[PDB]
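In the previous chapter we treated chains in isolation. Here, by contrast, the input contains two separate entities that must be folded as one system, with a combined length of 206 residues.
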Amino acid sequence: SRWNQDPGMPTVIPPGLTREQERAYIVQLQIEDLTRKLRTGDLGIPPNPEDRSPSPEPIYNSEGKRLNTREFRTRKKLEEERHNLITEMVALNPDFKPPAD
Amino acid sequence: PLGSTEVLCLMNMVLPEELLDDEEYEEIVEDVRDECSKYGLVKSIEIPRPVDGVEVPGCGKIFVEFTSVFDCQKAMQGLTGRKFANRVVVTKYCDPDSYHRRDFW
């Protein structure tokens, strides 16, 4: 399956919100989770390499250390999605102060 | 809309990229169905997908029509705050009329 079983923003959308105000809430909320996942950082890497996609050819630096690890690749996507979401609200701002992180 | 309706909207579950593959799409469908089926007898499901670069409305959202308002209201309470592919599941109610007319939001 895909589903998940076991102090952020309320998970239910408040009562009356414009199509825009709602979009702002959900984006602001993802910005929240993405920041958390990158802080811990709690990535979404599966424990076993069975469900994982085939790995790309490994590339290394001068020390012989691999650069494109699973973790690096996955942390990239999160950083990428977070960036676009942050950038999405750049063409919105109600004078919303950028974090600059 | 104002209050509870018989249509549940799951949000922040998927990104357009995941929906391109037919194999993955069909899977996402039954996963949502089976989970909701625990409160289910659900009437229908709608997961709009590119069709890029049209960017058809409701894309990135998942709609589930329940048979009753009570059922739906119980589905949201249970599903809200959960994870989906490690993503936080956000929820709201949708106007059933809008939904039948395929005006997905």
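Residues 16-43+56-99 of chain A form one domain. Helices of chain A lie at 19-40, 70-88. Compare these points with the single-chain example from earlier in the chapter.
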